[PDB]
Ligand SMILES: *[C@@H]1O[C@H](CO[C@@H]2O[C@@H](C)[C@@H](O)[C@@H](O)[C@@H]2O)[C@@H](O[C@@H]2O[C@H](CO)[C@@H](O)[C@H](O)[C@H]2NC(C)=O)[C@H](O)[C@H]1NC(C)=O
Ligand SMILES: *[C@@H]1O[C@H](CO[C@@H]2O[C@@H](C)[C@@H](O)[C@@H](O)[C@@H]2O)[C@@H](O[C@@H]2O[C@H](CO)[C@@H](O)[C@H](O)[C@H]2NC(C)=O)[C@H](O)[C@H]1NC(C)=O
Ligand SMILES: CC(C)(C)OC(=O)N1CCC[C@@H](CNCCOc2cccc3c2ccn3S(=O)(=O)c2ccccc2)C1
């Protein structure tokens with residue numbers, strides 16, 4: 001029931017899972033609360049406590065703006081924080097198998113949400129199934145988001161940037177110093193995350209300070225080379241200064257600006273974050289990763305291209321309809337409550353939404369490459385094209401390009417294409433296999449029979465869970481016992497990938513070849 005850590009004792013709680021037992025430690029602090037004069041600073045080491053810390057409920061989520069477009073709708077609200085927002089939010093969770101394992105592989109989850117939102121306490125991130133079923137240890141942490149986690153005055157340690165990434169780093173550090181006491185093997189740590197969490201994972205592969213803190217990496221629908229993932233030094237300052245003007249904190253001394261932003265209430269910072277950009281969408285990564293010179297020593301496209309990253313195996317993948325979720329947050333003619341048949345004029349209006357600072361020719365080039373129809377009279381043509389545009393540009397092609405470049409330096413890489421639409425999916429059918437809806441299969445929620453997933457979904461999650469765990473444990477995402485399709489390595493010549501679905505698991509090649517030649521070779525020029 002009680003584990004002694006380097007900083008003090010913590011008490012867990014027993015959970016009944018599938019006729020077995022999992023020990024959860026929910027809400028272990030891993031840093032000094034980044035409060036007062038610590039706001040905007042890198043996270044500070046925690047002083048010991050003398051009592052027994054009670055880790056029996058999730059801690060506070062970090063301060064963040066909430067998705068409000070669909071009040072009462074489970075499809076959006078399942079992603080909103082489900083614990084109190086507070087700046088006092090630097091906590092982590094541990095699920096260990098019962099009985100206490102001897103030398104168990106550790107899985108460390110990093111949530112996404114644009115670097116502006118998200119929390120480790122969400123139901124779909126519940127690591128008790130992985131601990132029960134595969135006897136791995138699951139760790140997840142809260143990390144600062146938005147301006148409070150990523151506001152940047154580069155060089156200035158009062159606000160250097162990438163704080164939330166250093167939050168993540170300090171938690172991986174905690175697992176190294178402490179996870180052996182829980183029965184974990186610190187020499188066998190696999191990072192996994194989704195969306196901005198997957199982008200985070202890839203930045204840890206790049207950051208020298210994280211290289212000794214994990215073994216392997218899993219990137220679900222995200223990588224640092226995605227266009228939303230890294231803010232420029234120009235942008236980051238313009239955004240910091242714009243936040244300052246918006247809060248009356250403009251000063252000539254940059255340090256005085258920070259001190260001024262320290263005396264504002266969390267809510268005034270949050271209210272003004274959306275408006276630091278003029279191209280202002282609910283899907284703006286207003287404050288995100290930057291080249292700080294500490295976490296990130298150089299522009300990550302350069303480090304990737306020239307082989308400057310941790311050499312290890314990666315598991316990378318994407319969902320079939322990455323882009324559809326984002327169309328109901330602004331694109332004209334779209335609704336989750338109808339089939340969103342849009343016209344040519346509405347499609348073009350959508351490109352202006354999602355490509356705000358792009359030339360007319362750039363937008364026409366997108367229209368040209370995506371509107372050469374197999375049948376021009378099919379009314380869903382423009383609706384599905386805009387979805388593919390947003391998903392190929394923002395997720396599928398950056399992940400493929402990341403996998404190609406990473407594997408060219410000699411490491412094994414495995415790529416998947418997830419094409420199963422959850423039977424319990426509350427969004428309409430036109431949105432397909434949505435961004436974020438593999439997560440529940442990965443965490444094994446379909447393994448609970450009471451949760452009214454189908455039998456085929458239980459088997460798909462069970463196979464996925466096995467492959468994730470075999471990858472974490474052995475660097476090889478096979479399922480070796482149930483005459484499963486063998487998952488080949490992804491090589492930049494042949495570019496083989498594995499499809500994930502309830503019917504047949506297939507090996508295909510060159511996912512989205514035509515679309516990604518456009519996005520990776522032509523569009524960066526425009
Ligand atoms: C850099 O920032 C300036 C200033 O941003 C404005 O003020 C902030 C407090 C916030 O409210 C933003 O939404 C504002 O736009 C940007 O300059 C503005 O640009 C728009 C059009 O691009 C124009 O209509 C405004 O009048 C401009 N305001 C000022 C004060 O110049 C600028 O576009 C940003 N980007 C770059 C590259 O400079
Ligand atoms: C699908 O719905 C959109 C959104 O309109 C809203 O949501 C509906 C479900 C319903 O509750 C309406 O009362 C709402 O207005 C429709 O987009 C609107 O279309 C009309 C007419 O074309 C236009 O006047 C509005 O400006 C549009 N609103 C936008 C673009 O935000 C769309 O037409 C619907 N399409 C189908 C095929 O049903
Ligand atoms: C939470 C996860 C990541 C699992 O799933 C989703 O978020 N969705 C699924 C359906 C509900 C919606 C929830 N989101 C709320 C606000 O969270 C964000 C703000 C800002 C930029 C964000 C996000 C999220 C991605 N980004 S983004 O990758 O940078 C991007 C930006 C612009 C165009 C395309 C992609 C959406």
Ligand SMILES: *[C@@H]1O[C@H](CO[C@@H]2O[C@@H](C)[C@@H](O)[C@@H](O)[C@@H]2O)[C@@H](O)[C@H](O)[C@H]1NC(C)=O
Pocket residue numbers: 054056
């Ligand atoms: C920590 O928890 C101790 C034991 O509490 C036991 O477990 C919790 C979940 C409750 O169900 C409680 O009724 C049980 O006795 C407490 O005795 C102790 O006071 C707690 N410490 C702090 C600082 O809150």
Ligand SMILES: *[C@@H]1O[C@H](CO)[C@@H](O)[C@H](O)[C@H]1NC(C)=O
Pocket residue numbers: 102103185187188
């Ligand atoms: C755990 O495994 C590592 C190698 O992966 C080994 O060096 C270490 O001593 C092991 N600890 C145990 C078995 O307690």
Ligand SMILES: *[C@@H]1O[C@H](CO)[C@@H](O)[C@H](O)[C@H]1NC(C)=O
Pocket residue numbers: 253254255256
């Ligand atoms: C104001 O600027 C001075 C030098 O320009 C420097 O001490 C620091 O950045 C600011 N002063 C304080 C007390 O923070």
Ligand SMILES: *[C@@H]1O[C@H](CO)[C@@H](O)[C@H](O)[C@H]1NC(C)=O
Pocket residue numbers: 462463466479481482
């Ligand atoms: C393999 O098949 C058996 C049934 O024959 C099933 O009970 C088990 O869960 C499957 N294992 C995996 C890893 O899919």
Ligand code: NA
Pocket residue numbers: 517518522
């Ligand atoms: Na081309």
